[PDB]
Nucleic acid binder design. Structure first.
Length: 801
RNA sequence: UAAAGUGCUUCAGG
């Protein structure tokens, strides 16, 4: 259950000078002293815990703390550069403007042991000491800013609408590497709720110009969904409350049981209560109240008395417009991002931070220099008369003068237009149809003739009936092209009845994309169609593939998507040929927010069986790309899931023991690489080139991991995918695994570009995403798992493309 | 829903 050591360093590829947003730390060899704090009352927000500790140090200089400057993680851990005049536990009081605070020695954090571990002598890096360093480095900014996870934010207006806005801050964390510790610094931007009166909040969320008329059920529900769980503060007295719900009734009629001077209790309206007790005549008695605290204490607050508390990060899903504006506002070219980080470093001034200097730490001002390697891309073999070989350039190629490897001929297909005939006319349909055939012929997926059926529809209630009709009627029906008028629930039903009921291949298309056609678009559309019908768009040039393909091998991609309770969705896909091109999908509904794939064993078993049925081979090796995992989970994830994979093999055959390689894929980190030489910048965004690989300098000191930017940066700064090998029975060299991983990024069939993660990992995402739409209704557990199960025929092919 | 990439993505009280 221990990750294997780095076997070697890669040598393949053209060298490339890079800078990473990792800054060398000079750490002393001294011993750090760790103390534990028990603060009563407990479960106070880390913020107030810090204020308490702050006043504690200021107040107890005379006796306890002296000249030194302690650091504090906000909870129970206090660290010092030199030992305190403590040898035992000590109890003390703190009055904020009363808290019981005790302090007891825990143990000495050894930085020398860390030095040694970084040189590679010790089997494990003392996580405790790294944590200690992290506490030192972020103690100051923790007092100066609003900490959110490992990031820090402050107030600049960058509105997104709907009561939300995007704040700019920075990420900070201490990381180990070979020889030395590193400080990772990056810009970050995330959504927050604007600090404002709740009355203004309802306006922005319900699209009112001015509050002004009670609320309709529709409005109340939308308002409830938005404010539920948010903190508010009262303006009629300052205390904060968390919103449990929004009353159905208006403040004028909403009541609560108040006990009179005599033991008798009477129902009193919120409005009347605020009139008598607070002398306040509610200006908006017709609006609902916020229910806070306990359901049992009946605490309701008028809207006009509440403000949305400042500093609350938005977690609920953003709208498409909000997401669009945020992406626009946050996109930075690589050169621009590098400069922003240099500014952050300058204003961070770590080398003048009294707490950093207190612990004798020093941080280098310049980014770490690292030599990357630009791996050669694989050739892409197409099929047809030409059998053309496409050579990716800058992570991109095209299909001009090329035809699908194994292109499917379409003799029977139907068009179902759910867009109003007014906008999408017969003229548009036959113009679109004509051009699609034309393009389909160029691509080698010949649409042999006109559609056998074409009708308009609406309501999303006409889907299954029409589909029942098409299947029973037209023999050998291959494809049903569906046309939608923008976002709509019909898409969900189309995929539900298509994938989950009748088992028919469907390809949706926006109304706007049939009105005005483009060769590229229609061409990209053919990529999905040919695949959905069982075709092979292309394959890696058979020769030039890594030696792993010398024996039957299966590639698995796994991911878990969590909703914004509703269950999480686990998806595992497996390759079904030697190219590898075709994948089968397994999917499961599981516990809300559970990271581990509960039913992995059974999912892997299903895939192994499908693989054997397809290839008549039993995999000698299983290559398992796992996306959506964190460092805090590598141990637990590897344990259950590695075992589950083994269990699948055993449950299949007593002595079937293929070599397993377990690789975690991570896009969600703050490692950024920049070209040192301007001439190596690609595109307007000036990013590193596709294929850029780094397995030195900023990587794990002992274990087997590497960064690989497999994709071309289009806009903003590229995120190099990180790959961590948690287990390897197959004893890959660094080069082979890195090349293999890069080539798998070229097998993704939705586009003729190298994508940012291996195809199987990507497909897993698509499968889980598709499951969402399948679960859309109109919760019996057995029914959820059932609304996610796919039709027999469809399971053989990549319906999720 | 042509596509990829880019930002995020847990203690008078009523």
């Amino acid at each position: 259950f221990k990750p294997p050591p780095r076997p070697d360093f890669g040598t393949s590829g053209r060298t490339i000078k890079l800078q990473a947003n990792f800054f060398e730390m000079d750490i002393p060899k001294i011993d750090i002293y760790h103390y534990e704090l028990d603060i009563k009352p407990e479960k106070c927000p880390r913020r107030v815990n810090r204020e308490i500790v702050e006043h504690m140090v200021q107040h107890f200089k005379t006796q306890i703390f002296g000249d030194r400057k302690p650091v504090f993680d906000g909870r129970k851990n206090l660290y010092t550069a030199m030992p305190l005049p403590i040898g035992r536990d000590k109890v003390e009081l703190e009055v904020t403007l009363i808290f019981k605070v005790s302090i007891k020695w825990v143990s000495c954090v050894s930085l020398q042991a860390l030095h040694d571990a970084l040189s590679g002598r010790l089997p494990s890096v003392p996580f405790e000491t790294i944590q200690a360093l992290d506490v030192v480095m972020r103690h100051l900014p923790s007092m100066r800013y609003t900490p959110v996870g490992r990031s820090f934010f402050t107030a600049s207006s960058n509105p997104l609408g709907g009561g939300r806005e995007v704040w700019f801050g920075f990420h900070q964390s201490v990381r180990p590497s070979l020889w030395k510790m590193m400080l990772n610094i990056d810009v970050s931007a995330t959504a927050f709720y604007k600090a404002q009166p709740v009355i203004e909040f309802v306006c922005e969320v319900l699209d009112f110009k001015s509050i002004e008329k009670p609320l309709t059920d529709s409005q109340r529900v939308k308002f409830t969904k938005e404010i539920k769980g948010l903190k508010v503060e009262i303006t009629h007295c300052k205390r904060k409350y968390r919103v449990c719900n929004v009353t159905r009734r208006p403040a004028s009629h909403q009541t609560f049981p108040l006990q009179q001077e005599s033991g008798q209790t009477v129902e009193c309206t919120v409005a009347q209560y605020f009139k008598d007790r607070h002398k306040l005549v509610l200006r908006y008695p017709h609006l609902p109240c916020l229910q806070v605290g306990q359901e049992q204490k009946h605490t309701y607050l008028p809207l006009e008395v509440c403000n949305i508390v400042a500093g609350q990060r938005c977690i609920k899903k953003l709208t498409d417009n909000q997401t669009s504006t945020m992406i626009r506002a946050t996109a930075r070219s690589a050169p621009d991002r590098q400069e922003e980080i240099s500014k952050l470093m300058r204003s961070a001034s770590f080398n003048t931070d009294p707490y950093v200097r207190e612990f004798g730490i020093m941080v280098k001002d310049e980014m770490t220099d690292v030599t990357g390697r630009v791996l050669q891309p694989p050739s892409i073999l197409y099929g047809g008369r030409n059998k053309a070989i496409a050579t990716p350039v800058q992570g991109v190629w095209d299909m001009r003068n090329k035809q699908f490897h194994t292109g499917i001929e379409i003799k029977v297909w139907a068009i179902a237009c759910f867009a109003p005939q007014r906008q999408c006319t017969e003229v548009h349909l036959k113009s679109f149809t004509e051009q699609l055939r034309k393009i389909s012929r160029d691509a080698g997926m010949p649409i042999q003739g006109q559609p056998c059926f074409c009708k308009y529809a609406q309501g999303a209630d006409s889907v299954e009936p029409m589909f029942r009709h098409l299947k029973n009627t037209y023999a050998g029906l291959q494809l049903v092209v569906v046309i939608l008028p923008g976002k709509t629930p019909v898409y969900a039903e189309v995929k539900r009845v298509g994938d989950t009921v009748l088992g028919m291949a469907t390809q949706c298309v926006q109304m706007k994309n049939v009105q005005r056609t483009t060769p590229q678009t229609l061409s990209n559309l053919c990529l999905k169609i040919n695949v959905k019908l069982g075709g092979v768009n292309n394959i890696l040039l058979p020769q030039g593939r890594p030696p792993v393909f010398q024996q039957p091998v299966i590639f698995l991609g796994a991911d878990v998507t969590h909703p914004p309770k509703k269950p999480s969705i686990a998806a595992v896909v497996g390759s079904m040929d030697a190219h590898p091109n075709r994948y089968c999908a397994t999917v499961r509904v599981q516990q809300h927010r559970q990271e581990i794939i509960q039913d992995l064993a059974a999912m892997v078993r299903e895939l192994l069986i499908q693989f054997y049925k397809s290839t008549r081979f039993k995999p000698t090796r299983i290559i398992f790309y796992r996306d959506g995992v964190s460092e805090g989970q590598f141990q637990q994830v590897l344990h259950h899931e590695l075992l589950a994979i083994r269990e699948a093999c055993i449950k299949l055959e007593k002595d079937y023991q293929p070599g397993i390689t377990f690789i975690v894929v991570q896009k969600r980190h703050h490692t950024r690489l920049f070209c040192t030489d301007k001439n190596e910048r690609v595109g307007k965004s000036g990013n590193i080139p596709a294929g850029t690989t780094v397995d030195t300098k900023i990587t794990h000191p002992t274990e087997f991991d590497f960064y690989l930017c497999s994709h071309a940066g289009i806009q903003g700064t590229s995120r190099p995918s990180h790959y961590h090998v948690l287990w390897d029975d197959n004893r890959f060299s660094s080069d082979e695994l890195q090349i293999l991983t890069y080539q798998l990024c070229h097998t993704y069939v939705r586009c003729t570009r190298s994508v940012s993660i291996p195809a199987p990992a990507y497909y897993a995402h698509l499968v889980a995403f598709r499951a969402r739409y399948h679960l859309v209704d109109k919760r019996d557990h057995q029914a959820l798992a059932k609304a996610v199960q796919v039709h027999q025929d469809t399971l053989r092919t990549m319906y999720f493309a």
